[PDB]
Design a protein around this ligand. Structure first.
Ligand SMILES: [Cl-]
Ligand SMILES: [Zn+2]
Lengths: 96, 486
């Protein structure tokens, strides 16, 4: 499939092989032509996400005074508290 | 007195301050390159990246020959090789181009330690960037700037740049000698793809041939193209410079000087806007951002990265990487990337949106790692930063509306020439269904001689459904950021 990479093998040589993410994937012909992501229930995934977010909450980025200054005229939503402009929409802007 | 210049990312003879300085009372000079299968990044790398490097090595080796010298190429870990060479060649001078990357700094300190305990003076010069990156961090108060805008403000109030170093010419060498030997080649010769393990059977000549010589040529043609002016081509330009800057076949400082001189003649002032160096500065900004953050290329434990609950789906990633998504615009781009090793910046944006915040909801880290494997110009920090910004995981620049994997292609070219070029199986389809081929009436597919879901994949996502969903996933994320920044 033309996607292999040169791994370091034993101390002796290099080994040509598929990259891990490829080796981990089922990549047989049907999937490649026939596989579609399942349709999932919106709220169920938001709630499942929200569970995760509570765990990721203390590692979110923290902005110093100087960084808050830099961010003011580039990401207004920081000091304003709302959603960023480009992401407060209903979906793909072209389609809608 | 024996001196060694160690090439890594500055594969050129022009503007090489560290090489030139090594040739001062040297007696003996030897240029060395050590094969690293990781390409100064977090990945192992594919056929086009390697071919580009090898051709950089050949040109460097050929150009050294003209100066009656040679390139010495060695396999191994630097920590293993240098102690042997020190004793074996009686080294007392070693020189490198500074590397601001965290991994490179660790490596260089370990080597500088081995050298010191072997009586070897170490020479370091800055020539991979326009500026001393640490001076920029100082001007910002001790921490690198978060936004490209702040970075621009800082560089605009910095000292004028000192001219490129004199290029290494026969005069420069000045009777300083490289001892060649019996069996120099095959013991220190530039390897070939076949020798490395690659299958070169179905392999056309490179759209992007490596080395300083081609870089310089392309630089001349690029400046002429600009001099005449004062998108049909998502396609590889003859004048593209980015892989050459990545490996130092073209010195950024030279390109900078050539740009300023042209600006001064075509226009009145000696005050060009910073946009003139947009390419150089964007690059420089990411080196600066990453130099003190060893986790710049990670989500977790990366203090500038938004923590996002990305989905895991090896099969969907695999489809995206092979350009079997069922979306022609995306597949075409990922196909050009696999075949050639370069895609347009707006195309990078398109495939990144689709993979991450747009449709698949897959970590930007996965995307980054595919680009590291296939993209000639990918640099550790530039590539990580982009992927972070493009997925709304960091703040280097304004966020934009997620590109549509159908409409962005229609705006670019409705004839779909790009698509047909990289996707043969689709060539028959009319412009009506060329971006949305699953919408073809079951007979139009018979005429095209391509059945959706037989000869070309079914669209892996209901794009509109996934977009609305993911956009909500994001809202909830940035909502919770405001709630905790409170
Ligand atoms: Cl650097
Ligand atoms: Zn859309």
């Amino acid at each position: 499939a033309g996607l292999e990479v040169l791994f370091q093998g034993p101390d002796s040589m290099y080994v040509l092989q598929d990259p891990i993410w490829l080796l981990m994937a089922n990549t047989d012909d049907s999937i490649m032509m026939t596989y579609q992501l399942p349709s999932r229930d919106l709220q169920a995934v938001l709630k499942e996400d929200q569970e995760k977010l509570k765990l990721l909450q203390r590692s979110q980025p923290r902005f110093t005074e100087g960084q808050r200054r830099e961010l003011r005229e580039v990401h207004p939503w920081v000091h304003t508290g709302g959603l960023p402009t480009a992401i407060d929409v209903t979906g793909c802007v072209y389609c809608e | 007195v024996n001196a060694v210049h160690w090439f890594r990312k500055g594969l050129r003879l022009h503007d090489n301050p560290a090489l030139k300085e090594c040739i001062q009372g040297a007696d003996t000079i030897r240029c060395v390159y050590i094969l690293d299968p990781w390409f100064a990044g977090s990945s192992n790398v594919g056929i086009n990246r390697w071919r580009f490097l090898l051709q950089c090595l050949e040109d460097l080796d050929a150009n050294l020959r003209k100066l009656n010298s040679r390139l010495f190429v060695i396999r191994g870990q630097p920590a293993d090789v240098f102690p042997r060479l020190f004793k074996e060649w009686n080294i007392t001078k070693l020189s490198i181009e500074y590397d601001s990357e965290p991994f490179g700094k660790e490596r260089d300190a370990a080597i500088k330690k081995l050298a010191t305990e072997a009586g070897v003076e170490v020479i370091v010069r800055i020539s991979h960037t326009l500026y001393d990156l640490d001076k920029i961090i100082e001007l910002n108060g001790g921490q690198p700037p978060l936004t490209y805008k702040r970075f621009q403000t800082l560089v605009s109030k910095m000292e004028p740049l000192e001219m490129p170093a004199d290029t290494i010419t026969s005069d420069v060498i000045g009777k300083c000698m490289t001892p060649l030997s019996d069996d120099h080649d095959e013991k220190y010769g530039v390897p070939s793809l076949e020798e490395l393990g690659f299958d070169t059977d179905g392999l056309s000549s490179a759209v992007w041939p490596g080395g300083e010589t081609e870089a310089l040529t392309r630089l001349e043609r690029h400046l002429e193209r600009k001099a005449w002016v004062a998108a049909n081509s998502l396609l590889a330009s003859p004048t593209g410079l980015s892989p050459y800057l990545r490996f130092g076949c073209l010195s950024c400082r030279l390109f900078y000087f050539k740009l300023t001189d042209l600006y001064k003649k075509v226009k009145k002032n000696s005050s060009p806007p910073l946009s003139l160096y947009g390419q150089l500065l964007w690059r420089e900004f990411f080196y600066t951002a990453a130099t003190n953050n060893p986790r710049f290329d990670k989500m977790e434990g990366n203090p500038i990265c938004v923590q996002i609950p990305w989905d895991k789906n090896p099969e969907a990633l695999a489809k995206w990487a092979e350009g079997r998504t069922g979306f022609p615009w995306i597949d075409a781009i990922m196909t050009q990337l696999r075949q050639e090793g370069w895609i347009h910046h707006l195309a990078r944006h398109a495939v990144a949106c689709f993979l991450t915040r747009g449709d698949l909801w897959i970590s930007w880290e996965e995307g980054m790692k595919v680009f590291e494997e296939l993209l000639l110009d990918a640099d550790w920090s530039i590539n990580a930063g982009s992927w972070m910004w493009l997925s709304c995981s960091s703040f280097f620049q304004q966020f934009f509306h997620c590109y549509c994997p159908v409409g962005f292609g229609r705006r670019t070219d409705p004839n779909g020439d790009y698509i047909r070029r990289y996707l043969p199986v689709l060539r028959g389809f009319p412009a009506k269904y060329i971006y949305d081929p699953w919408n073809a009436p079951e007979g139009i597919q018979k005429v095209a001689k391509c059945l959706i879901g037989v000869n070309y994949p079914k669209p892996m996502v209901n794009h509109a459904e996934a977009s609305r969903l993911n956009i909500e996933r994001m809202k909830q994320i940035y909502q919770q950021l405001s709630r905790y920044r409170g």
